[PDB]
Symmetry: C3
Subunit: 275 residues, 3 copies
């Protein structure tokens, strides 16, 4: 596919083609671990994709293979910049800004697909989970390490994982910190499909296209609806927000706006009280 570069970053690469955007984590020397900068850039890129009216689907993946032949989606938080209370940015401030990225991916009204080749570990594992869909290469390796490396993600990393693979498997994943193959990840319900490494991107594009032929309004409403099963009032905000969006496309709704601007009482008398 004709990928065009959309913006230049230090830690990532960002492209667009038709209704598809592609974001690539580009720190293969650290198994694509994110440092605070990486997250800022990821945030910026996803935000860009959110703002682009032509983009309906974002493919997220890791740069590879590395000089050692190994693939990686993301290895999570860069431990070489970790200190007191978080990951230290260039200015000395401790951060856990991936939490903001998690929220953006989760709430943005575009479908996000993780394309996992090789390692999706730790925060990189949580990143794949929060994407709407996951397509794995048959060399993909999934797991958490928190309790081994002195961390934990007790937010979407735990609760949301449990809403994917159930409570028994979710706990196993976190407590033992083992590694799981692509086939195991699919069997437990956290990977949508598995393809050969050299077919990964093409599968991503194929899935993106099947989505891009759908109604954008139906898709955004559904995404909000799924979030509403998890995120209480925050979820209701997204779902009700879309109801308001749709209501702002009605004649009935516009009558209320015009009435105010024209400084007259609104006339809703023609509109029925449906069952």
């Amino acid at each position: 596919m004709d990928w065009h570069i959309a913006k230049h970053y230090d830690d990532i690469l960002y492209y667009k083609a038709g209704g598809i955007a592609k974001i690539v984590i580009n720190r293969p020397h650290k198994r694509n671990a994110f440092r605070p900068q990486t997250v800022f850039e990821l945030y910026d890129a996803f935000c860009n994709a959110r703002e682009d009216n032509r983009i309906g689907v974002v493919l997220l993946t890791g740069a590879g293979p590395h000089s050692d032949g190994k693939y990686a989606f993301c290895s999570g938080g860069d431990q070489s910049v970790r200190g007191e209370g978080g990951y230290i940015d260039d200015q000395g401030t401790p951060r856990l800004n991936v939490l903001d990225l998690q929220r953006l991916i989760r709430s943005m009204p575009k479908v996000v697909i993780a394309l996992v080749a090789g390692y999706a570990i730790g925060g990189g594992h949580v990143l794949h989970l929060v994407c709407d869909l996951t397509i794995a290469a048959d060399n993909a390796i999934f797991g958490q390490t928190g309790p081994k490396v002195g961390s934990f993600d007790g937010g979407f990393g735990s609760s949301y994982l449990a809403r994917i693979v159930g409570q028994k498997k979710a706990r196993e994943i976190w407590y033992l910190c083992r590694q799981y193959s692509a086939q195991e990840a699919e069997r437990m319900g956290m990977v949508n499909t598995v393809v050969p490494v050299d077919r990964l991107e093409e599968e991503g594009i194929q899935w993106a296209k099947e989505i891009l032929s759908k109604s954008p309004l139906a898709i955004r409403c559904l995404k909000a609806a799924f979030n509403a099963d998890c995120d209480g009032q925050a979820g209701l905000q997204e779902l009700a927000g879309n109801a308001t969006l749709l209501y702002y496309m009605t004649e009935e709704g516009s009558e209320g706006k015009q009435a105010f601007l024209e400084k007259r009482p609104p006339d809703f008398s023609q509109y029925p009280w449906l069952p």
Copy 2:
């Protein structure tokens, strides 16, 4: 064996022993429901709810059709769809399947979807809200909303996610692909798969295993499962059953008699248990 219980235009309705059977009968539209179909379905389920002998309802689609094809339900009849809903005979737009969803979900009888061939769109959601699903090996499952300009962001989304998990639920809705009976079982939304010509017999077999159980235990469990999903509405069903059971106690009856006899109640004999 099956005795007809009431006559309808769009559906068929039978009863035998503790089992009722409701059949969507519009095979010319792959058993799509129009507002009338829903009214009749509602009426039939309500009837089944009211019948003290009925413990289990089997829900299925009429088939095979003249073209040899099977269908459970294809969802909302798009040929009667207009502004704001599906237009009934009287011109009023409706989404009354939402009421049917609620009745199936809340009624204290076990409802089993028997899916042969297509369970698509609103027909897919209908199978989901039934307590159990038994599929024929020719069954085909899927959503189409984002393709045909619709969506079910209620039980169609959230409840689906409580069955197959969030990853698969989203795939189902976003891509609108079709899934085989075997795939549907593997992902957790179908309870078992049998050959087409064994579907009804399997339904009857499952119904019978349920019919030999305590009706009180079953209704309490169904409410309990709903309570994990439906907040205060779910608590209403569950607490409601607690009240029903409390109205079978001597302690509870003392309170009633005391009021009717215009005297203060005496609960002093009853302990405050741990």
Copy 3:
């Protein structure tokens, strides 16, 4: 492994070795059914394990094989002592005290692993479910019987089961009261791994050891986090409670304590308001 007896009980056995405790239900004549006393002792043992700072993992299992060659994890509430409103203890009081045990297993900040050989039925099934993890022998048999024997567990027995195997299977389990093999139990997501009968304990020990090499603080926080997806404010209590525990290890927190004891206003001016 060198198991040392830790305390004597009538209905159960209790051992400890390294960071592992083992609790065994010992009433094989009733397929390890629990009577009120059994629950009291189980509670006491788990509570002991909770109090022991060396113990990080508890293995729960049933005594066997029985004289008839049959294995059992637990067969649930002892129906021979069941009367009006509950299971009658030795003093005549009806009880459903297993509900308290369920809560202790679920909330205690140690990982609990059910090792299921043969029958895990009824309340014994629910007991396996509330344990964090389940390892089954390939002879394991799982199921509920409530609607057959005039009972039901509409608490963790229903809702939590549904958070493991999904709503369709959970309902099947309860409505039909069939039996399910170890392989079926794994396939539906309620068993973490299946091993041969004579490997069950060794697998338990192996899993326990992989957990015991992890950070205890990370593990307790994760366990609370998983409970928070299910138990509303009770879940928030456990999770927030751990946040308080961690806050009580900070210098910032200690300044507040010292200020009060020294009868002076606290000085938090040096501490930043992080993003």
